[PDB]
Design a protein around this nucleic acid. Structure first.
Length: 94
RNA sequence: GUGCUCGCUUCGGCAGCACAUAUACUAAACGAUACAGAGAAGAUUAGCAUGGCCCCUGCGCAAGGAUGACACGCAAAUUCGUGAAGCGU
């Protein structure tokens, strides 16, 4: 029991760093720059795998959230244009 | 303009032939530097692989650059049991 419990304590202490959520939505356009960096990270993640479903879905949720209509319709239009079969994804974009 | 032909009448004047539309695209990453040093379940490293919104060396579909470097797990949707309160023709 000391081995499994020791693995539970060491595993609980094995997490790497807490989040640093500071300066949330501040300095006016600086938040738009942070959205540009996040959208750049999403563009690189979707760029690593062209067949990626998940990353496209997260780009659609965060898109529709912070991208309003235009860029969100560009995410759903790009992913929809890159997807012919697997119409369930077309139902997600719909 | 030149050369030639008196071709027309004076050395020079006039006329005819031959030479016959150039130039433009003309003229005005890599150096230098501080840093720190390198993947594969306890320590060290063979290598070869896969896709680019990354390249250099290399005539080169030869090959070489620490395995040349870059590169983590989200799911399109529910269903049944127990207790408490309110309403009911």
């Amino acid at each position: 029991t000391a081995e499994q419990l020791l693995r539970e304590a060491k595993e609980r202490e094995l997490e790497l760093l807490p989040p640093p959520p500071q300066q949330k939505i501040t300095d006016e356009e600086e938040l738009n720059d942070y959205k540009l960096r996040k959208r750049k990270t999403f563009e690189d993640n979707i760029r690593k795998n062209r067949t990626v479903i998940s990353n496209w879905i997260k780009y659609a949720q965060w898109e529709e959230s912070l991208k309003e209509i235009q860029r969100a319709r560009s995410i759903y239009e790009r992913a929809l244009d890159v997807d012919y079969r697997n119409i369930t994804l077309w139902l997600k974009y719909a």
